[PDB]
């Protein structure tokens, strides 16, 4: 099956998922000098006050913090978006070392990790319908650098012991994703894809310029997770990132000067 190893990693995915070589794949390098300020982008609206987290799952590629998306409780709107996108889950991509782990790059700089807050367009009714549409998803991408601890991440770090292996889940209620946001909502935006199979070209990417800081101890706990199932050979869950893909016929827009 697909993964991040020598025999099933990103350079192999195109054999089962030919859209891997498509016209709007993600992630990309963000060339900060070429990105155009777009004075017409509307204000970005992150409304997470009523968010309802339910569960945390190790799916064998990453961990997902899942939300109740059966009503408009946690929504992303404005910026480049038309209409209302509902938070369904967040996950991270990270490295074996602090010098790699992000999927997007900024002037070829790699961050230690990247948070993806996944939202689906309410006009398509559910996530499965939304991923079939070019405007189905909005993913808020946030870079992690290693420095000071992020207090709002520790509740996540402290549950990972309970979901070490593929297929393990744990109750994860009352987690506030506002604790993972940087001060500034200045962003870059472009049309792209899921960065994991099935690599569907359904994402409006919104990548924040300001990283968040996490501690060395916090990312070490991410690196103790396993890709494998319980009672299988231990394979550390590290380097679960796809490298930068060709930009092709796309323009990256900046919300800021």
Report the nearest approach of Zn ion to the CB of residue 231 (Å): 28
Nearer to Zn ion, 193 or 226 (CB): 193
Residue of 19, 18, 140 lying closest to 79 (CA atoms): 140
Assess 86 for contact with Zn ion (CB under 5 A): no
**Residue 91 is assigned to a ligand binding site:** yes
**Residue 104 is assigned to a ligand binding site:** no
Residue whose C-beta lies closest to Zn ion: 116
Nearer to Zn ion, 38 or 198 (CB): 198
Interface region with Zn ion, contact rule CB under 5 A, candidates 9-17, 32-40, 111-119, 141-149: 111-119
Which residues does the annotation mark as catalytic?
61
* Residues 116-145: x where in contact with Zn ion by CB under 5 A, - otherwise, as a string: x-----------------------------
Q: Which residues contact 44 (CB under 8 A, 6 or more apart)?
A: 76, 78, 79, 185, 187, 206, 255
CB neighbours of residue 176 within 10 Å: 13
Interface region with Zn ion, contact rule CB under 5 A, candidates 15-23, 114-122, 146-154, 231-239: 114-122
Separation of alpha carbons 233 and 253, rounded Å: 45
Report the nearest approach of Zn ion to the CB of residue 153 (Å): 16
Nearer to Zn ion, 74 or 117 (CB): 117
**Residue 93 is assigned to a ligand binding site:** yes
Nearer to Zn ion, 116 or 166 (CB): 116
- Residues contributing to the annotated binding site: 91, 93, 116, 195-196
- Residues contributing to the annotated binding site for substrate: 195-196
Binding site for Zn ion (CB under 5 A): 116
């Amino acid at each position: 099956h697909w993964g991040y190893g020598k025999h099933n990693g990103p350079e192999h995915w195109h054999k089962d998922f030919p859209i891997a070589k498509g016209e709007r794949q993600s992630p990309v390098d963000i060339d900060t000098h070429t990105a155009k300020y777009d004075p017409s982008l509307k204000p970005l609206s992150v409304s997470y006050d009523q968010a309802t987290s339910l569960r945390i799952l190790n799916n064998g590629h990453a961990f997902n913090v899942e939300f109740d998306d059966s009503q408009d409780k946690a929504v992303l709107k404005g910026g480049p978006l038309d209409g209302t996108y509902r938070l369904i889950q967040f996950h991270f991509h990270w490295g074996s070392l602090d010098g790699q782990g992000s999927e997007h790059t900024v002037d070829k700089k790699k961050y230690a990790a990247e948070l993806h807050l996944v939202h689906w367009n309410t006009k398509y009714g559910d996530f499965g319908k939304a991923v079939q549409q070019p405007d189905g998803l909005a993913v808020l991408g946030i870079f992690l650098k290693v420095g000071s601890a992020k207090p709002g991440l520790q509740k996540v770090v402290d549950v990972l012991d309970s979901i070490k292996t593929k297929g393990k889940s744990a109750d994860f209620t009352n987690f506030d994703p506002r604790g993972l946001l940087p001060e500034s909502l200045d962003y870059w935006t472009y049309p792209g894809s899921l960065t994991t199979p099935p690599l569907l070209e359904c994402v409006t990417w919104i990548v924040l310029k300001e990283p968040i800081s996490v501690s060395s101890e916090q990312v070490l706990k991410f690196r103790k997770l396993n890709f494998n199932g319980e009672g299988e050979p231990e394979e550390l869950m590290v380097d679960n990132w796809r490298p930068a893909q060709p930009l092709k016929n796309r323009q990256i827009k900046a919300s800021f000067k």
